[PDB]
Design a protein around this nucleic acid. Sequence first.
RNA 1: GAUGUUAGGAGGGCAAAUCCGCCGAAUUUAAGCAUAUAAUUAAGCGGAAGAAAAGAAAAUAACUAUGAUUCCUUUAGUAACGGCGAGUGAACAAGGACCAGCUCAAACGGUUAAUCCUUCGUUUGGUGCAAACCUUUCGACGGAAUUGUCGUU
RNA 2: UUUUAAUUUAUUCAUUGGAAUUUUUCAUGUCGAGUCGUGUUCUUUGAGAUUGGAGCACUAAUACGUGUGAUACAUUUCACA
RNA 3: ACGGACCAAGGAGUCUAGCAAAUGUGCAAGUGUAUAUGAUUCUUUAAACAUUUUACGCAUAAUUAAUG
Lengths: 147, 52, 211, 204, 95
Amino acid sequence: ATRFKKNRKKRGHVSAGHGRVGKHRKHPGGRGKAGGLHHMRINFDKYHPGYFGKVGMRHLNLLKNRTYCPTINVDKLWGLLPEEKKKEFSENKDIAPVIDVTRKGYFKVLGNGKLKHNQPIVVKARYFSSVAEKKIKAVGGQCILVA
Amino acid sequence: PTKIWRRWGRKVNLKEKRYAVCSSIAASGVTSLVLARGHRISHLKEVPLVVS
Amino acid sequence: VAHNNVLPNVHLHKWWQRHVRVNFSKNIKKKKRRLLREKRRKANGGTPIEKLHPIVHCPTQRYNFRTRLGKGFTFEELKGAGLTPRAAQTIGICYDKRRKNRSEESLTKNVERLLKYKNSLVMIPLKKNKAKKGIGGIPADADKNTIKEFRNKKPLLSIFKKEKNTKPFYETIEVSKIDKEFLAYKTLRRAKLAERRKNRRQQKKDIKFKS
Amino acid sequence: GAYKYIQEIWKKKQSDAMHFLLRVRTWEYRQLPVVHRVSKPSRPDKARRLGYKAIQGFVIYRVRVRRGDRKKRVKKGIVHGKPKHQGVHKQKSTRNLKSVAEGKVGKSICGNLRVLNSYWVGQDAVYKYYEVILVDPNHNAVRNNPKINWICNPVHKHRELRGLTSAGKKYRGLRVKGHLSAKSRPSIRANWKRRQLIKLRKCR
Amino acid sequence: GRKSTIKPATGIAVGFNSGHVVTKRNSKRKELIKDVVREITGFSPYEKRIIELIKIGTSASTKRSLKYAKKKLGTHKRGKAKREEIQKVVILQRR
RNA sequence: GAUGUUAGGAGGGCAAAUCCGCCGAAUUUAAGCAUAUAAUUAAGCGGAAGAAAAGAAAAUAACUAUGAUUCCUUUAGUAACGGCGAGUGAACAAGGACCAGCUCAAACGGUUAAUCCUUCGUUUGGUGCAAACCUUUCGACGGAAUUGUCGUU
RNA sequence: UUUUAAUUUAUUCAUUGGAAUUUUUCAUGUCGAGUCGUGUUCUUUGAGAUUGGAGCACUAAUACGUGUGAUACAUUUCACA
RNA sequence: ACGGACCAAGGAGUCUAGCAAAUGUGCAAGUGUAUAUGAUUCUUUAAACAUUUUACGCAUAAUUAAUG
């Protein structure tokens, strides 16, 4: 990989592509994020707007396991289960699938997307969106709370 | 100075490795490719040759 | 800094070349550990080097649904299996004094696991054809013929592994059994709203029961 | 059952009797040399509650130690550095006076012995007194005992100098567990080394 | 949140006693030593101060005794416990 | 307590890559610099092993709960700290390697220290050509120990 | 050559103790003090009305106790140790 | 204006971490089998091969100091 490097093609060019006037010096602007708010301020404000300052209150120790909550929208509930069983459930109107999304790894069911019309489906989840539940029972299904 | 923490090895995707092995077997299965690689096979009966 | 890059964050402001280390011997160590465990399972002469561990439930709401291997069966589980901790630790059963069985489900599941292990056990006499019926819950000692005929049969190492769970993430119910009046979102919201006063009621119940 | 009464008595230290005995014995210890052997424990219940036993190879030394902080070892107050490091008076030692006391006797005065523990004995304005239990690792009465003979192995030499006695465990942060210690457990320096040891796999 | 040791958990994940629905399952020598040590030691000087403050027997005196015990021992809990114990001994010696 | 060229013993010094205590900077970065950073680093003093150190909860969690320590993957450049600037920065859960638990103190034992050590002897046998080594329990003596050894849990 | 598994064989006679669990009672025992803790000072930490350590001052309770539950308090539940 | 008396040999944009863009490649709402395990593989081989039907990262959903 070292023979594909751009410095190789400037082998006999004196300045190595770094300029004859400005030269390549050692940290001519500072080190790291040195000049923020002083002479790199234009860069900071143009590319990282809200960088300086603090907002909000502290959460002293977090324990992300408490609030871990993967989500799934209602438009993927039918795609969760295999194609042949999807065909069977759609064909037979006397029975409906009850899907435990927690086993697949989802805690909350969100309401984005379109469910199939007149296809009942029961969903078991730890949390439900209001619109998700509305669509579930609009297509004739039911939401079941589990823990 | 050369250091021991150079990137000596590479991580290759398992799917790409399996693809490469399958392609190598397929290439070994065609007579012209073996001859091109340099094996003197002008006298064998067939290039996917198998024996008892 | 320049252009539209992420702001640098590299924590390399100390003497890090002294702390760099690269594992050239990962697979060599793999081989060494494999060789060591093969050597000790040859040394102990038939008895597996693995020890039985209980099936426990992972803590926190993240891993609530998942089970794994805990360390040590509880005193209650060992008693349900009919053996003392001191005797159990001599036949490859791990025991810990810290865990407690808050649920009958865990108690019975680990007890049945212990019973299955006990039934799978075949005991080699301590004194070379001086078979005895054992103490502390240790099973009665097997005799010469069964020991000979079972020594040349593959050991059941699947019992030591954590059990696979049946996955009924799919199932079917009859449409007429669908409750069309339930309101899951409203139930969740109401439970959250009422949590504070019910904790108050529970505290008052505890104070009353304290007398 | 006498040890329980002795312990309850020593639990007071402000009663008339305890005050009087503390006064007279601290006066005697002041006149005695800085490190001196005692024939038998002056607090038999406390020594016994520590590791002490009445076997032959067990001895006890009383040690005097000076109180307060030691001041920075810079010649006059002429530290040549940033103002953050210019303080010389309020420098508190990492080791406690108890650990310093056991070191005073374990370093070279009786280097043939092993320091087990130490206890209180007395106080004063300028001195803290301590009694240190030491074990002879070469006495057969200690060696043949299935207990206590762990100290004969040459991995317990100068525990007081490696911070392995109870005072050492205290000043190393090993008397607390969990989130209150966190980064002290395998030793502070070992934990620090582990926490920035950068590991690179061969194949990345 | 708070649970209930009886009345099994509701099957939902929020609120009071939420969670899965698993099946739940549930002075003859000290005081003699105390009297002996009390007889041969007595009370500390700060204990004596608290004793006389309690003996004064006014509301301001009891508040002062609580403040003094808290200052002497550290922590409101230890100060309060010491005050209660001293009041008990004051009553027991008043009888 | 002293004192003993009394009998038998121990410590001292070297060596350090890994390891355990202490002590302890500044260069540097902040485009200046003083807090900060460098760094709980370098230098200095002391102490061990083939590993050391840590270690059997005055621990987590808040769950359907886990169960000594150490290390790896990850948590996570995250919670957090910070002229909130430059910079710094863990823990729990999860997956693995390995896997091991214990005893003093305190309790109880006084129709009986039931303990320990020193020295001198006796034999029960074994491998060695030898040199030497492993096993042996009957003691006797002199002491230590009730200001507490040992047994039980 | 080293050790270390499986495989060979043990049979009579005897009294000397010890251990696990299970029956029926007595009795709810012990549990580490100038220590913990608190205040203050310095240092250390990501630890923030202080993470640990140390110096100094004060100085506990007795398992119904006392320590932890990452914001300083008072009254108090709960969990864990 | 500074360097160069002469000749030979040596002599300077590299390595690692992290981010992005570009392009090539594989798979695709999934992707990467991490550490580790197994296996008549064990000169090569410290590499190749493999992974009893929710480990983890990134992505699959955003927004808010925040209860959410």
